[model samples]
Target chain A: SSALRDGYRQAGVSGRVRSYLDLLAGLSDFREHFDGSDGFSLDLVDMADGPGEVTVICCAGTAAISGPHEFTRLAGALRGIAPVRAVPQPGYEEGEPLPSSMAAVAAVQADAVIRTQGDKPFVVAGHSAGALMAYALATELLDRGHPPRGVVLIDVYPPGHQDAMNAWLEELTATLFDRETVRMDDTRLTALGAYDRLTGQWRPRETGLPTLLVSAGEPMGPWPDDSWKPTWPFEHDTVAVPGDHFTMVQEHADAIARHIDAWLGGG
Target chain B: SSALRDGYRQAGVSGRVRSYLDLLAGLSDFREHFDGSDGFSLDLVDMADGPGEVTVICCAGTAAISGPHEFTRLAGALRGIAPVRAVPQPGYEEGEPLPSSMAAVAAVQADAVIRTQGDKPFVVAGHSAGALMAYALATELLDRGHPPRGVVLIDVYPPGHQDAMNAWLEELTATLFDRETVRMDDTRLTALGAYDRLTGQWRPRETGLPTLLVSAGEPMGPWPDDSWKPTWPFEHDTVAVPGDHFTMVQEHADAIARHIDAWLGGG
Candidate 1:
């Protein structure tokens, strides 16, 4: 119990924070960790609204403190084809409990989707570390008997691809802290560290679900080291989008959205 | 005339493009080079709407193909304190002509501000190369007798600070093109090259105006090389924000906005 309190305190959670954690732990989809917290709720914001049979649920990666706004342009491009919804990373926002693991996070995400979309067809998609969550979400949905229509992975690397993941993470982290405006706040660092560890430990499994991987076409040359090449270890329908891991979302969101729309054709 | 045509063609302008360039050239603020084109228009978008006396005009750097949306969060945070307006870099959107030089660009930017804000007290601010534009804008405004209240430079470097500028630009370029989605399109590349050259050629002057330089508190940590230390080569009131060059605007926008709002209080 002391350890649980310590963990929550380490994560900057206390008082009403515990109650918030209690609320999350109370959910049936999430079991209490020894810390007395389940996981954080995934707020599904409507990025694009339209008349369509399917909804695309997007998860942002922990690459930076990036949130759902990362999909603004992409969601706009997907307008009229499918309404797009995105979930903010837990813990990035103030007051949310730190996630125990990727599995725990995905469980809540899947639960939220089922409750919101409820047996309705939806595709779970994620970028970078969020891709791993999307995979975990696919697994969660499968267990709950509400399988998603498909899975979309944008610039994802499996856990075993440690070299690539570490390089990318290090570079991104360095870039982030490099700004004078970005201070090394202990709580934010702890959250980032937790997600980084969770991202590295979780291995993606081959679920017989329709999956699409959108890989970045270029190599980051000597960012941390020489020419970082990202490899996708899964056998799936993959397409290469132009731009680096981040830009694929920032600059070329429209193209990514179009490809996704095509893949999800009238189904 | 042939060289002008060649330059226009090289920059991806043709047919009605010549007319568009002609329109921009027609502005008395701009003079035509032999190329028959002057420069591009800087579009001022309202990032925040409020009842505030001081307007902050923001310029995005040539760092990425970043547009006005980069300030969305920052603008919202500055709401009620100071209305924030941002200008898009020319040639970023689908139909604009390429900027010939920073002077040319800032001239048009100043023209737009005069036409729109017209002697209303405002602050000119920019991030990275945008900082240089803000400096240029301050100069242009002083010449036109509509000098801004002050200047805010976010993570800026001068032309003489070639190593820092080159290193930052190279790393950003590498990171951008490394993504599979970001193809090395010639036209885009040309525009980037043009801006990079313009950024390098322009030198900032001490305009005897109120100036605040917000540097990133953190070093980018030798992204291209080892521990890149940014130096401010001017005698100006400087402060370091928490994030790096980009994040200062992206993550620390609120803090930057707060600092700026304080700097502009009741003025």
Candidate 2:
């Protein structure tokens, strides 16, 4: 039971858990195993020796943290339904190859999960830009002949006009990540121009995959935010929660967790 | 005095004559004179022949007989107004060619009226199947040289989709023309189908021709009949009267004639 509890705790702790005390305090209950990994592969822990009923792969958006923390958060949220394995995204260090790096991180996480879970129904999820990455990963998996059952995009722009969306993203990321000097409108204008320039160049891979889009209720810019809006064909659902870009996800962790649980239940 | 009595007799006869007789009676009162032997020409016959005020062109439809008698009926009915000319149609014989003949007839009628009337705001009218023919004629006239001030279609099928509409035409014609075989279901089916078909293809011609569509109120079939219904592009005006299709047109001849007079005057 402590093993399961430890698993949930490991999954639940946001960001990195550097200390044993924090890890132990977090692992105090059976629900702790549901918290998932700290973005690291915790196969060595061996809490889940039995064949998993389902596998959930967590994808991080363009964020600085590329470790177990994001996966742990997802796993902790989803642990009640089935075992979750955190697929850590690569770090977005300065001068990284933007979308390519994000795509690579997603592909790695999805592949790792599939290898570990073998024939089980699995889900891939990402938040914000992470959500976009998750979708890319799901598509990649599908192309590689190992498609996830469903994907979750947590308030990210759909494919097609990513640059146009970057402005809104920058504004949102800045609000959430606590950065200054990000002008969403200017970013949107630039992205829109980019979209115009790239017209008819980028072709998205068609993956008839079901998707869920979660929105942040607070205004991302001057525009009223409704999160379930997507740029691609995917099953979508929207939820309005308190707070702006960042706190909405952090504060509504339980809601997110519940959604993941319901998602795992084939809801 | 004798001339006035003869004119009244013609009008009253038109009021009582059934089917083709009513049409004949209307035409009889008009003086027949054609400006051209072919193409388009106007022949204005004054019922009253008093002051040259307005011109009304009666467009004939696909009835079996559309000759002097029909013209007399229309003329007799329309006598009190400014000169009303009955523009005869071509290719009405039993073995006539299809669409081409009809188009030629329309061109002739429309062109003749336009050339003769030259700049005088005129009203164009058609009865039964002739209403559609009238539309073709009016559109052609507008396309070539002249534009009618207004148009009226009485108990007519809309122009377009003749093949699929043949069944409905058969039903309406059977109900209204054949009287003995009139069935309520058949009539209703015809009406619904015709309505659907008309809505689908009934685009208003760019001629900006003001249109009036008159429907028979008394059931053309064995079932209880009510006023006719109007569909779009044509401002529908329903007039409920006694008698089956044939009798209603005959009995209401005077009323129709009066309405036409008023419409032309108003226009």
Candidate 3:
């Protein structure tokens, strides 16, 4: 049962978060893939029945082609401790509209989190570019008096260091044989452009929430010896999930879940 | 039969666009009030039946308190040429989050417009501050290859004029009868802050849509002589309607409709 979950579950995810029934066989397993109301994709999986004290909202990176199953092993590791939810960006599929701005994307994800966590304190974990999005959501939530327990960033580039992003994009095209099929739609492309400008001016916001960096040991994409070097202003925790950026969630889910569990236990 | 329609009919005001309406009536006559989705209020009202050659999407300004009913006279005058729709801003009602950024607000509105007008050559019109939003939407659409037929800016202040907007806000307070009840929520306030930064740097985009500025003769709010001073980069037309900015649609909806009718008839 613990063998690595592969294929449709990992490839072009989110669409199946709701319909993936084998996972549903367990009385505790169920998921929600919401492509309505906000145009962005939101899915809530690993919903437990009256057991958890906290919820973990996971934000997937890039084209939102990843979701709960992408983090399957990680959640499997922390199964009883928290209810897990996923927010995938739109546009990986042919017709879904990608968000036009990073803020808009954040608004959509944060909204779903707020709606799901009625009166319950929640924690956020964003992967890759989604780490930037998580920061934005935390800042927005804190302003309105709702605060998250903490945030976990998985192998995202440091803010304002756009060169790293450019290098990564160049590497993806260089490495992928079917690069043509990986083309992002106009909406997500627009979001990337907006975030590029936004992150250039992205200052560290003081949300007072505990921030953690679960970096990659062998970070994928970009030039040689890729890795996450976090420098968040406030003091926080750091852990290494054993994989490159690409495999951090899919391959080393347990390692990633271990640190998140550790962070929640404290903050 | 032709009169300025009013109310939620979000039941939000378009910067006090004839105030809000009762949130009851036929369920199908209503759409979702999107404060929970985008942190800003967005509603699409007066959706027409069947296919059409063109669609006219209207963006309402302020608390988004107004809608298609606000333009009853105009639509009544120009019936059947285009399908009419309205978008109100958020934060007029309690618990509704106002948008913190103008770009985010534009993202929500533009998404609705795109979703509503599939492959149709649409036109955008913004009322008051919504005029700024409508312009933003028009520019975004043009970039994506779906150009609008025209843009009608109803009494928006000239862009890059921060001092003028400041004067307007000051005057709103100074002229209010019940200053305490007229407070704008933080979400809408944040949107104003963003648009403040935005308009300060707002240079008119050359979208080449037939531009028209509907100037208010009896301009309300802000200074006593509040009116739209047009300075678009391209040649455009302007006509003064019968009432002040606040009452332009309320009293002279027919006249406003007529001019829009004439302009849409040509350049």
Candidate 4:
């Protein structure tokens, strides 16, 4: 029944799109409480056949967004997966913008979902900035008694602001944001600054959670460019793909989604 | 015929106890300079063969008399596989009462050996307090022109002293020594604090010398039982053996000797 509600909310949207949004919301809530759990917890979602569980978590990275075309393409590819159920977060159309604190997002989303699901496992994921958010959420969930079985992060950044990151972010922003819609004004800078202060500034917790980091092979902007590489607190696995920063998650979405599916299936 | 001399000196000493003292004296002037022409700068004893074209250096522990016994056993074990030559340090007798600075012992011993052997690969080893000396000697060798291939340590205390350790040492002295031997007027508390102001303490070097540590499974004392646990800066491959602190080295001599033999063989 909850799945049907999620389905109606994104009726025309692809299943992958819905799943992606759901993942984001779930991760945002999980990051809120990373220091208080002793055992494990789960949240379940019932589909037509039975119930399936997914872990929701986030990792460290700078806060940034890719273009809409890229998001839509990524969502579509995720739809091809048999078990996944993606849901997009609302308010992006009104440009409500991604929340600065991923922990805040995870707390809200997890509270709402857990109230309905009771004890079913839930899955969450993110790409780049979103991936970073998912990492934080995962840790918070782990601390609050829910241990996510799996987490996937695509081309995410490492925590903290280094001297060289400002230039790299500027170049990335120029390439990704729509110049006409998203102005590079004081408001934009303020928003980004606030986001960085709220989400990117904190020291990372040593989360002994299972995680997967998907990285891009080619350089995003130029050679000798400075950008943080995403690595989990504990030793997890890593895979490198043949795309740049955006293409790894957007153009090669099918491949990425397949990897996620395999990961989720415990492969 | 350093090997023959070593055999003779050890043979002269009464008892089946191997005379590590004679071996230490034989290599008391070994030294080598690195001008960057040689592909490798350090040399170690090839215990697989008879002391071949080089002298082996051995350090003594807190129980000085046991040094020769340990060395003889090690040399015999190696000779079982192949003929091996060794040099053992003397004047490290426990009853003779040398300065507590293991570094001073190592420095003095290394200086003597390098002078005798000229240019050759040096192998240094110590058990407990002796390990600290071995480290000091290796450091001194590096500071001069020669470097050792490897340094080995047996069950030893952590590098520094704690406030509780000083108190414990005081209690130990009261139990182990007679009224005359236990000097209540002693100002120095821990062994580390006993060194002269001129002979600065030896800090561990970050050189990439191969290191091996053999630890005891049982505690050295009942209270503050974790005193013997190895800590940072002295990073090395470590193995824990069953037995009390002293008995582990003395009773398990054959096992310890075999371990050293294996280490020399690069196993």
- In candidate 2 chain A, what residue range of length 10 has the lowest lDDT sum? A26-35
Between prediction 1 and prediction 2, which has the larger TM-score? Answer: 1
Question: What are the runs in model 1 whose C-alpha is more than 4 Å off?
Answer: A1-40, A162-165, A176-186, A222-229, B1-267
Question: Over all chains combined, what TM-score does candidate 3 have?
Answer: 0.39
The sequence of per-residue lDDT tens digits that candidate 2 reaches over residues B1-267 is 111112223333223222222222222112121233433333433333434456667775444333223545556666556556666553232222112233434545555675566667667776655566667677877756567777767666554534433334343443333332222221122122222333224444555666666656656445444323323354544443345445545456665666655565664
lDDT of 1 by residue, B16-77 (tens): 22222322222212112322244344445644577776666676665444565556767767
Candidate 3: regions farther than 4 A off: A1-50, A67-69, A91-100, A177-201, A219-231, B1-267
TM-score, one value per model: 0.41, 0.33, 0.39, 0.34
Report the Cα lDDT for residue A169, model 3.
Answer: 38
Among all windows of ten consecutive residues in candidate 1 chain B, which has the lowest summed lDDT? Answer: B1-10
| Candidate 4: residue A82 lDDT (0-100) | 36
Which is the leading candidate under TM-score?
1
Q: After aligning candidate 3 to the native by TM-score, how far in Å is the CA of A244 from where it should be?
A: 1.5
Instruction: Give the Cα error of residue A199 in candidate 1, in Å.
Output: 2.1
For this target, which candidate reaches the highest lDDT against the unseen true structure? 1
Error of 3 at A162 (Å): 5.8
How would the candidate models be sorted by TM-score, starting from the highest? 1, 3, 4, 2
Better of 1 and 4 by TM-score: 1
Tens digits of per-residue lDDT for model 3, A1-267: 110122212322222221222221211111112323543545545434345777777766543234344655565666776766766554333444434345555666677777767899778877766677767777778877788888887765656554555344334532332323233332232233334444445665776888888766754435455333434556777777677656666667777666777667775
Candidate number 1, chain A TM-score? 0.76
